[PDB]
């Protein structure tokens, strides 16, 4: 009775200590202590050995550490499956995580927490392709996700240039109640601006200008659409830049220009000969601590700083040069 459980906690306190030092057979002998005296190791004790190997980054050692769980017949703990999926996602196991996901699909356990940590862990390593596949498969059915995950993958996919994966997640996010705000649109506009075709980012912008309260355009949003129009490969594009400035000017008590807005306007107004319009804007840039280094950027994009210096000379404006 009390003595039996009083003796049980004696090994129990040191049983997890065999996982404190990350022992492989030391924890086994502790289980062997009670297997000899007839003390069925409660699944929490059974799980402690699984933690011992998973803290050593033992891929198949942990699998063997769990392979005996079904052989004995004890149903593993919720923490048991949670611990393994964290390791497999951390190392990059693509199909191994789904193997556990089937187990809770048979043991009357929800996979939401396990699939959430599995998805998040896969992004914590550079397994970007794996992260999209796991999230999309689980969220295709009924699986609500925390808003933190939605922000992470939309930004992360757009960071590496995965608009196809990012757009699908955004469409999937809006299916489950959550409404896309200006932050999500800003992430999408990062890659749509660098796509050559201007009217793929404008369609996104018109979805925000005439949108609801939360999805209203931000100062970063106008920068992306301005950038997408000034580096088109063909056709006149200076008039559409005039509209965007006019809309930004009219909506001014909520939107204020920043360094990049003046930088892009200097570049756009100098490529086509609207030099006057540039000199004006240049001034604004002048009072920014970034200087013309960002306006120059690298030698790419036609070297806009070279344009401003050259075009000022060849037109007549020399004092401002």
């Amino acid at each position: 009775s009390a003595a039996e459980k009083g003796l049980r906690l004696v090994f129990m306190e040191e049983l997890m200590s065999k996982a404190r030092n990350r022992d492989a057979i030391g924890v086994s002998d502790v289980i062997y202590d009670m297997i000899v005296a007839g003390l069925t190791p409660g699944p929490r004790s059974y799980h402690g050995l699984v933690v011992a190997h998973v803290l050593n980054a033992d891929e198949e050692g942990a699998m063997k550490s769990l392979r005996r769980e079904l052989s004995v017949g004890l149903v593993p703990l919720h923490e048991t499956f949670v611990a393994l999926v964290r390791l497999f996602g951390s190392k990059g196991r693509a199909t191994r995580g789904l193997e556990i996901l089937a187990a809770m699909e048979k043991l009357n356990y929800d996979i939401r927490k396990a699939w959430l940590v599995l998805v998040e862990e896969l992004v914590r390593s550079n397994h970007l392709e794996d992260a999209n596949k796991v999230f999309l498969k689980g969220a295709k059915g009924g699986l609500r996700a925390t808003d933190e995950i939605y922000d992470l993958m939309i930004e992360e996919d757009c960071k590496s240039g995965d608009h196809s994966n990012a757009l699908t997640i955004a469409y999937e996010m809006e299916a489950a109640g959550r409404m896309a705000t200006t932050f999500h649109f800003n992430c999408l506009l990062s890659v749509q601006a660098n796509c050559g075709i201007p009217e793929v980012a404008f369609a996104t912008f018109e979805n925000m200008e005439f949108g609801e309260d939360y999805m209203k355009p931000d100062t970063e949003t106008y920068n992306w659409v301005i950038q997408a129009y000034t580096r088109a490969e063909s056709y006149d594009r200076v008039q559409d830049v005039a509209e965007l400035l006019g809309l930004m000017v009219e909506d001014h008590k909520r939107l204020q220009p920043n360094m990049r807005t003046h930088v892009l306007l200097v570049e756009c107004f100098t490529k086509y000969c609207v030099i006057r319009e540039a000199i004006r804007h240049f001034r604004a840039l002048k009072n920014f601590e970034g200087g013309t280094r960002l306006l120059h950027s690298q030698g790419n994009f036609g070297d806009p700083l070279s344009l401003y210096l050259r075009a000022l000379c060849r037109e007549g404006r020399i004092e401002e040069l």
Partner: protein, 413 residues
Amino acid sequence: MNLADPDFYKIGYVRSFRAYGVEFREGPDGFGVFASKDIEPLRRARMIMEIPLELMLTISKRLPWMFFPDIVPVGHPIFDIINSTDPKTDWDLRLACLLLLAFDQEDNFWQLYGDFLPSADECTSLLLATEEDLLELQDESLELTMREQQHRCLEFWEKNWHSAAPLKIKRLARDPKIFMWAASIAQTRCINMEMRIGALIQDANVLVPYADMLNHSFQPNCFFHWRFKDRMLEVMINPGSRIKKGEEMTVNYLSGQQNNIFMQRFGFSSAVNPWDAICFSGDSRIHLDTFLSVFNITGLRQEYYYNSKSAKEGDSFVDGAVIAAARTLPTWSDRDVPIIPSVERKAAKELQEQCHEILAKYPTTAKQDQQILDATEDGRRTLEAAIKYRLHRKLFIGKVIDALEIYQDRILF
């Protein structure tokens, strides 16, 4: 559990109100909505309690005040009372004025529906209690708030009923105890919703006859929906939910906010209160992924589940108290993938024993003890209700202690 009088269904039924598989009861309580026959699981929702817009009050929630079932006439000297009311603080005052107006205007629906409403001798709201009855409550913050809230309505009674009182404005509240009845009714039976009337989406505090009779339970099975075209409020049975042949159908009042100090303010008292707990402190921390693991409680604080497919009926010891005290406590998690240290000196035992010391069997004041429960004296409909609140808080604390010691006992299987 006897059904209501035939006049209850009518008077409103004649004004296009249809109830399909329900029948309100009459037994002494809130009238109550209990079903008949069986519905079996469905796909999306089953509509019930077709309630039109004409049988409402629906004052707007923001300036300007508008009432779509127009009650106030043009130039009536009661819109000045409402337009002089402080917004965003006391929505139950102008609502009380509308309710009082819908008692002496014409043969309005609320002139007849007033009888079925609880009277002054009835009702449980603390705005109708007395000084020593409010004192009979193991709480001082709630006592202070309710003593202030019994005022701020005496004050907004002499500012508009002071010896000048045009007979239109008079004869609505000749004394400051029926205005308290209207204020309590407004507090108890108001619901804030979104109403798309035409091209206007607005938020409004509304009063719904035949729908306030839906009792409360924190495990609900009823939605409130507003049909945009024909302007009708409807209760909806939840998808995939079996319904028995007379059991309670409930719609929650408050969710995501509780603490039993605002729900109790809005009527009766908490019973299971799945969102309230007492701050512990006093110790370092307890583990997180073992309190919800011994009872197989699902995580994700906003949505906590028990997974009835747990074991061979492991226990009958899950309640709102368990699901509440499973997320309002120290709950150290650290890296969330630890060795699960079974250090009962630190991760268990004494620490929760310290909680047992922190909850030293009601150590704060202990104004009373086990003797209070079931004193067997019912009266005034507001006394024995503060006693009920004390009973339920004591029961919550006791069951929290019991669950904690069950958890600390069962960490090894």
